[model samples]
Target: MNLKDLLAHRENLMDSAKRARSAITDDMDPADAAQAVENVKSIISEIESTDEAIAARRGVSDVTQKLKGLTI
Candidate 1:
């Protein structure tokens, strides 16, 4: 059981989530918008959770590092 693989999957999902979010922005429909909103909410929740998992992930380093170091 290697966490590296899982991190890669998580990372891929993160990219996918972002793309889904971007895809949501265009050609908005009430039903589609609702779907996007629900997915977005899940995305944020999963994204943030992955950070904690990444930090705890026994591998080379933090996969979610850059975003974690973010400051605004």
Candidate 2:
């Protein structure tokens, strides 16, 4: 429920995705590189979910406030 921890976790997950992306190289076999790519994708999914949790904790209006300017 702590926004600070959630933010930190999201940052760590972003770092992990970056690390996984950098690990992929031309020297690796296609399958091995694909595995690394998968790890990055998994990290991205976690980040998205964490964002949702942060939004929920912050409350719906906080997330939707900017939309107030859009009349459509």
> lDDT tens string, model 1, 1-72?
257776886787789788888887656888998988899789778878777677676443444565567845
Q: Give the TM-score of candidate 2.
A: 0.76
Q: Output the lDDT of residue 5, model 2.
A: 93
Summed backbone clashes in each candidate are 0, 0
What global local distance difference test value does model 1 have? Answer: 0.75
The per-model lDDT (C-alpha) reads 0.75, 0.86
User: Each prediction's TM-score against the native?
Assistant: 0.60, 0.76
Residue-wise C-alpha lDDT for candidate 2, range 3-71, written one tens digit per residue: 889889988998988888888988999999888888889999999999898888778666578577674
Q: Deviation in angstroms for 47 in model 1?
A: 2.1
Estimate the lDDT of model 2: 0.86
- lDDT, candidate 2, residue 36? 83
